[PDB]
Design a protein around this ligand. Structure first.
Ligand SMILES: [Zn+2]
Ligand SMILES: [Zn+2]
Ligand SMILES: [Zn+2]
Ligand SMILES: [Zn+2]
Lengths: 76, 78
DNA sequence: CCAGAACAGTTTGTTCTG
DNA sequence: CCAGAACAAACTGTTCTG
């Protein structure tokens, strides 16, 4: 039918850092946790994270990753 | 003495399309108005437009541009 | 000076590799 | 199959031109 990324609703590529996600949320999460960016939502931590706008709010996209269960860790 | 962009609060470069802006807002405004995309704010049409985050929500940045008085035009003469 | 164009750096996303 | 690396397209911002 089609695997859907639990972060953004794009087509998922596989189970990454614990969660069914697309390729972009995969690198995103990795890059976000890794560098210290201190991302702050410019709205109210409310943002819809979807395919077209996922890059809009890194704070909300990262928060969604963390709530979906994504966890850092290199090749289990 | 430093001139402040009225859209994002960065340092302003001049008066562009009718208001005090930085060069990034200047082009953003023209690209946005001429592009094929009517941006949909993923929040509440409320977003803060400041230097670090101006890129975050093009819908709200464009809204802020238009509300500030920015208007498309060609190269006008005095 | 400022709009538009051209150029350039930054960012996000996709394909390659072990 | 999946992390991480290498690659690449897309997007945002800066310097050049009339
Ligand atoms: Zn995704
Ligand atoms: Zn947000
Ligand atoms: Zn600005
Ligand atoms: Zn917004």
């Amino acid at each position: 039918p089609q695997k859907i990324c639990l972060i953004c609703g794009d087509e998922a590529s596989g189970c990454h850092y614990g969660v069914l996600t697309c390729g972009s949320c995969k690198v995103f999460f990795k890059r976000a946790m890794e560098g210290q960016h201190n991302y702050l939502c410019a709205g109210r931590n409310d943002c819809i994270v979807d395919k077209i706008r996922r890059k809009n709010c890194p704070a909300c996209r990262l928060r969604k990753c963390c709530q979906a269960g994504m966890v850092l860790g290199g090749r289990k």
